[PDB]
Design an enzyme around this catalytic site. Structure first.
Site, PDB file in Angstrom:
ATOM      1  N   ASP A 104      -1.511  -1.756  -0.910  1.00 45.72           N
ATOM      2  CA  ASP A 104      -1.815  -0.506  -0.219  1.00 45.72           C
ATOM      3  C   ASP A 104      -3.237  -0.065  -0.558  1.00 45.72           C
ATOM      4  O   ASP A 104      -3.486   1.079  -0.941  1.00 45.72           O
ATOM      5  CB  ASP A 104      -0.794   0.579  -0.565  1.00 45.72           C
ATOM      6  CG  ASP A 104      -0.920   1.806   0.326  1.00 45.72           C
ATOM      7  OD1 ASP A 104      -1.584   1.716   1.381  1.00 45.72           O
ATOM      8  OD2 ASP A 104      -0.363   2.865  -0.034  1.00 45.72           O
ATOM      9  N   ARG A 163      -7.873   6.397   0.320  1.00 43.20           N
ATOM     10  CA  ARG A 163      -7.013   7.440  -0.225  1.00 43.20           C
ATOM     11  C   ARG A 163      -6.451   7.066  -1.590  1.00 43.20           C
ATOM     12  O   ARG A 163      -6.078   7.958  -2.360  1.00 43.20           O
ATOM     13  CB  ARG A 163      -5.871   7.739   0.744  1.00 43.20           C
ATOM     14  CG  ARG A 163      -4.980   6.539   1.023  1.00 43.20           C
ATOM     15  CD  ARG A 163      -3.868   6.877   1.995  1.00 43.20           C
ATOM     16  NE  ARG A 163      -3.199   5.672   2.469  1.00 43.20           N
ATOM     17  CZ  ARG A 163      -3.615   4.945   3.497  1.00 43.20           C
ATOM     18  NH1 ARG A 163      -4.690   5.279   4.191  1.00 43.20           N
ATOM     19  NH2 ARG A 163      -2.935   3.854   3.837  1.00 43.20           N
ATOM     20  N   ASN A 164      -6.377   5.774  -1.907  1.00 46.21           N
ATOM     21  CA  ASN A 164      -5.833   5.307  -3.175  1.00 46.21           C
ATOM     22  C   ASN A 164      -6.920   4.943  -4.180  1.00 46.21           C
ATOM     23  O   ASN A 164      -6.632   4.280  -5.183  1.00 46.21           O
ATOM     24  CB  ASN A 164      -4.899   4.117  -2.947  1.00 46.21           C
ATOM     25  CG  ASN A 164      -3.563   4.531  -2.357  1.00 46.21           C
ATOM     26  OD1 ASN A 164      -3.079   5.635  -2.606  1.00 46.21           O
ATOM     27  ND2 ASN A 164      -2.962   3.648  -1.569  1.00 46.21           N
ATOM     28  N   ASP A 183      -2.061   4.277  -7.842  1.00 47.03           N
ATOM     29  CA  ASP A 183      -0.813   4.022  -7.128  1.00 47.03           C
ATOM     30  C   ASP A 183      -0.447   2.543  -7.157  1.00 47.03           C
ATOM     31  O   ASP A 183      -0.769   1.796  -6.227  1.00 47.03           O
ATOM     32  CB  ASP A 183      -0.902   4.522  -5.683  1.00 47.03           C
ATOM     33  CG  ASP A 183       0.451   4.558  -4.993  1.00 47.03           C
ATOM     34  OD1 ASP A 183       1.462   4.191  -5.629  1.00 47.03           O
ATOM     35  OD2 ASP A 183       0.504   4.961  -3.813  1.00 47.03           O
TER      36      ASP A 183
END
Length: 295
Positions: free
Chosen positions: A157, A161-162, A175
């Site tokens: 992922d 955003r991560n 994450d």
């Protein structure tokens, strides 16, 4: 079979990470979701006995079933086997004694990289966000992912955003809930969960397979996010039947406005329909290093 690949999730939990639960004071909630929530907290006596330390604590929803609890311990074991790296949100401790499992990781005060780019977009310049910071961000994320690949781990992922940002313009990948060791092999996912289609490689969408090369595809989409200053990928293209058809037939995003040609050349190789033609993160690092030397 007298030789075997050691599964990090099968190993026992190392109590060197055990931190007393009564020494954590929870503060504001940093983020929430289907997993649970991550809250900012103060760890009294974490590194130094009489020194409070601001940390991040990941926890599950109270209604989490037994399978959801065992998954959080696996991520703890994966992070324990992974080891420390400057470009990942490193594990600092855990609260595992007869209660809700608490995962204590490093705290990044400036938040996620996606929202950071959007607020600094209006004041961008080629206290100002510059092109040199974008190249540094691309370089640090390539190193963190190369460290993951060196441990036979896929993130699954990777997105702006991560990526978290802390003091000194240091970026850390966070994450690791879907992080998988695939040493045996490379990973076919079977489950019911919403997926980030616009960041996924075609083989992941059509066959639900995840490899080192699918992480490289996501990294290319991250580079587009970075040099477009936080814009959504594939603007004007909703995730629908026409999106899958175009992606399968070879439609790719054009070069963002502020990306150098060498950086867009990396994106295109990351977006190769043949996974074996995509570069490795080790190759991406040595490529970005040659770019940074020329100033």
């Amino acid at each position: 079979n007298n030789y075997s690949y050691i599964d990090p999730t099968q190993l026992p939990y190392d109590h060197k990470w055990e931190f007393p639960r009564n020494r954590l004071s929870f503060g504001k909630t940093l983020g929430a979701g289907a997993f649970g929530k991550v809250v900012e907290a103060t760890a009294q006596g974490l590194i130094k006995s009489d020194a409070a330390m601001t940390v991040a604590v990941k926890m599950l929803k109270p209604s989490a079933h037994s399978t959801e609890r065992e998954a959080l311990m696996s991520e703890l074991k994966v992070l324990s086997y992974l080891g420390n790296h400057e470009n990942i949100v490193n594990l600092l401790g855990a609260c595992t004694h007869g209660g809700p499992t608490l995962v204590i990781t490093e705290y990044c005060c400036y938040g996620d990289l996606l929202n950071f780019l959007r607020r600094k977009r209006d004041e961008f310049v080629p206290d100002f966000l510059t092109l040199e910071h974008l190249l540094s961000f691309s370089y640090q994320v390539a190193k963190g992912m190369a460290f993951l690949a060196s441990k036979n781990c896929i993130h699954r992922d990777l997105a702006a955003r991560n990526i978290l940002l802390t003091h000194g313009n240091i970026t850390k990948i966070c994450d690791f809930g879907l992080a998988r060791d695939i040493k045996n092999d490379n990973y076919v996912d079977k489950g019911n969960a919403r997926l980030p289609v616009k960041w996924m490689a075609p083989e992941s969408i059509f066959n639900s397979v995840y490899t080192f090369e699918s992480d490289v595809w996501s990294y290319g989409i991250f580079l587009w996010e970075l040099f477009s200053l936080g814009s959504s990928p594939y603007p004007g293209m909703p995730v629908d039947s026409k999106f899958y058809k175009m992606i399968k037939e070879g439609f790719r995003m054009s070069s963002p406005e502020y990306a150098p040609a060498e950086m867009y050349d990396i994106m295109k190789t990351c977006w190769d329909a043949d996974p074996d033609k995509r570069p490795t993160f080790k190759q991406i690092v040595q490529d970005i290093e040659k770019q940074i030397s020329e100033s």
